[PDB]
């Protein structure tokens, strides 16, 4: 033949993308959002299945030559039981029937919707969970607290809010002593609008005979009390020991208002 002028290529100098290793990347990949491309480095064909198993909520895409690849989130598969009963975990790892917050090899990532509480997608789980002895004071108050002003008033989230209010109306009419309904009434009072006031009064006014005498003596005085109250020009609530004692979450709106009307001297 003839003597070809041979040239060797300049030394390969990798980049961060080329040096990436998906095995080290669970903390990078779990917080990724919808439509966000998480680049993960070269991936061998015999690993693609492993990586798709580990991250079933993500699509595995081939971005460039030599197996260069990325994960694109497609969905959130977290379950109400694992997402709704906590405001702090955003995902969990499932292995061998067990659920763990921390990553272990062999585990499958499941991810909670980032706005799950803000959407009302937890309302059917927590309406149940919060009732009974499964009640977690901190979680269930937070759940009820946060239902007000949902999705910054997006229409889906505003309906969520309404529907839940009706469901809680029907429940707490039956027995407002049950700690979810006490918190519900407590939080209606904080909202302090026409609709929350008439929801409180509607609920309190449907309580049973025994409830009213155990809890609402301030709102339903004995005739002996009422006719004593006429003598003084102060409203009854300002002196009546039944109202200084009483539990404010069970006062009617009128009575709760009136308690504010009692002039104290500064000091």
């Amino acid at each position: 033949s003839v003597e070809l002028p041979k040239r060797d290529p300049p030394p390969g100098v990798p980049t961060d993308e080329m040096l990436l290793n998906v095995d080290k990347m669970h903390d990078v990949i779990a917080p990724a959002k919808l439509l966000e491309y998480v680049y993960i480095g070269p991936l061998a064909k015999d690993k693609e299945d492993k990586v798709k198993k580990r991250y079933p909520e993500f699509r595995l895409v081939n971005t460039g030559p030599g197996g260069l690849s990325a994960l694109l989130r497609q969905s959130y598969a977290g379950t109400a039981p694992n997402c709704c009963r906590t405001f702090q975990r955003t995902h969990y790892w499932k292995k061998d029937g067990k659920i763990s917050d921390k990553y272990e090899e062999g585990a499958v990532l499941e991810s909670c919707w980032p706005d799950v509480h803000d959407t009302g997608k937890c309302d059917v789980d927590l309406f149940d969970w919060c009732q009974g002895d499964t009640f977690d004071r901190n979680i269930c108050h937070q759940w009820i607290g946060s239902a007000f002003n949902r999705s910054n008033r997006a229409v889906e989230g505003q309906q969520s809010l309404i529907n839940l209010y009706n469901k809680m109306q029907t429940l707490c009419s039956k027995d407002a002593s049950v700690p979810i309904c006490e918190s519900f009434l407590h939080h209606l009072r904080a909202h302090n609008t026409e609709d929350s006031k008439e929801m409180i009064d509607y609920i309190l006014r449907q309580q049973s005979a025994d409830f009213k005498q155990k809890y609402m003596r301030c709102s339903y005085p004995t005739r002996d009390k009422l006719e004593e109250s006429l003598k003084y020009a102060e409203p009854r609530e300002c002196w009546d020991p039944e109202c200084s004692n009483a539990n404010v979450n069970f006062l009617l709106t009128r009575n709760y208002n009136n308690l504010g009307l009692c002039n104290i001297v500064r000091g």
Partner: nanobody, 118 residues
């Protein structure tokens, strides 16, 4: 002379409504507790609703939610709204005025009849 004539009663089947009025003269609401009273024959009178000189209200338990008392300052007239009336609301209704911190300056007005029957 202090006048507390009540007016507005009558006949209604149960569930209807009635609005009593008391056009007080000789007394001012700015320093009087005004109250609506009942008296069914055979029984002693009873408070039904009351309003302080500042405007705080209060009710007898059996009428709470159904009745609501209000007042018009410029008209010096107190009202009783009676909704969802029960056969046991049958009584003569009248108004009562009490001077804020005097006790002896108490007055009673003329009754009005409301009866509720099928």
């Amino acid at each position: 002379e202090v006048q507390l004539q009540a007016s507005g009663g009558g006949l209604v089947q149960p569930g209807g409504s009635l609005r009593l009025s008391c056009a007080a003269s000789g007394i001012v609401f700015s320093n009087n507790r005004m109250s609506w009273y009942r008296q069914a024959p055979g029984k002693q009178r009873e408070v039904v609703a009351t309003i302080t000189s500042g405007g705080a209200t209060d009710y007898q338990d059996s009428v709470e939610g159904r009745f609501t008392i209000s007042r018009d300052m410029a008209k010096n007239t107190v009202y009783l709204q009676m909704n969802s009336l029960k056969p046991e609301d049958t009584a003569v209704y009248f108004c009562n005025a009490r001077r804020d911190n005097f006790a002896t300056a108490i007055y009673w007005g003329q009754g009005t009849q409301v009866t509720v029957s099928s």
